[PDB]
């Protein structure tokens, strides 16, 4: 009952930088470089692995106030990250849940990151493109900030 789409992007940054930069410090990396994209975010429980719950806070005087992001599992061995949006303007009012999984792999130019998008709709309801486009475009925008950061600051969490 979900639309899964596989996407990927190449980078000149080893999988090890992006890796720590998108799961360990991402919540210290995203706001640093991406003040325009995301306002801020901090973990409530865990460090960014399975059993971890993340809470993101958007602009005060904005449409979005608060949202709960739940993490599913990280395999540092593979540098994989899977999480799921439980509630918030993330699921509007007609959505059940939205899951996103991304794995970083080293490529001949650096590392090609594969980002999976899954929009789990309910009943006959359906997730629009413009909906996942704005949410994903932002999410991608953050990884965009961080990407630049490691190539300029690969010293993250190391």
How would you describe what is shown here?
The protein is of the alpha+beta class. The chain has one domain: Alpha-D-Glucose-1,6-Bisphosphate, Chain A, domain 4 (2-Layer Sandwich), CATH 3.30.530. The chain is 26% helix and 41% strand. A seven-stranded antiparallel sheet has the order 1-7-6-5-4-3-2. Helix 1 (15-23) packs across helix 3 and helix 2 (26-33) crosses helix 3 (129-152). The N and C termini lie far apart (40 Å). One of its GO terms (cellular component) is cytoplasm.
Number of strands: 7
**What is the number of helices?**
3
Widest β-sheet, arrangement of strands: 1-7-6-5-4-3-2
Q: Could you name the CATH class?
A: Alpha Beta
Summing up helix and strand content along with how strands pair, one would put the structural category as alpha+beta
* CATH homology group: START domain
GO molecular function: abscisic acid binding; protein phosphatase inhibitor activity; signaling receptor activity
InterPro entries: Bet_v_I/MLP, Bet_v_I_allergen, Plant_def-hormone_signal, START-like_dom_sf
Protein name: Major allergen Mal d 1
Organism: Malus domestica (Apple)
Note the topology.
Layout: E1 2-11, H1 15-23, H2 26-33, E2 40-45, E3 53-57, E4 66-75, E5 80-87, E6 95-107, E7 110-121, H3 129-152
Antiparallel strand pairs: 1-7, 2-3, 3-4, 4-5, 5-6, 6-7
Helix pairs in contact: 1-2, 1-3, 2-3
Quick summary:
The protein has helices at 15-23, 26-33, 129-152, and strands at 2-11, 40-45, 53-57, 66-75, 80-87, 95-107, 110-121. By secondary structure, the protein is an alpha+beta fold. The longest helix is centred in the C-terminal third of the chain and has 24 residues, at 129-152.
